[PDB]
C-alpha cells in the first residue's frame, strides 16, 4: 500500500506537483486537497465525486476545473 511516485509538470500553463507525505498535490504552489479511495483511485476537492486513476489525473482535473482561476488554500 505504498504511495504513488512524485510528479512535476506544466499542464495547461500551470505547474502541478505531487509527492508522498498520505500524498500532497499543489497547483502553482497552492496545496490542493486530494483523497485516495480504497480501490486506488483519487479525487480532489474540486472533483470530489469523480474518481480518476492517479493523483496526477486528479491534479490535471483540478486545472481543467479551474479554467485559469487561482486555487484558494484549503
Amino acid at each position: 500500500p505504498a504511495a504513488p511516485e512524485s510528479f512535476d509538470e506544466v499542464y495547461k500553463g500551470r505547474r502541478i506537483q505531487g509527492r508522498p507525505a498520505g500524498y500532497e498535490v499543489f497547483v502553482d504552489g497552492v496545496q490542493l486537497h486530494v483523497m485516495r479511495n480504497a480501490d486506488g483511485s483519487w479525487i480532489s476537492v474540486v472533483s470530489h465525486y469523480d474518481p480518476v486513476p492517479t493523483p496526477r489525473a486528479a491534479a490535471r482535473a483540478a486545472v481543467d476545473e479551474l479554467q485559469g482561476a487561482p486555487l484558494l488554500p484549503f
Binding site: 486537497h33 476537492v45 474540486v46 476545473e65 479551474l66 482561476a69 487561482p70 486555487l71 484558494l72 484549503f74
Partner: peptide, 9 residues
Amino acid sequence: PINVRVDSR
C-alpha cells in the same frame, strides 16, 4: 455570492 469556495471564482 459564492463565499465558501476553493476554486477562487
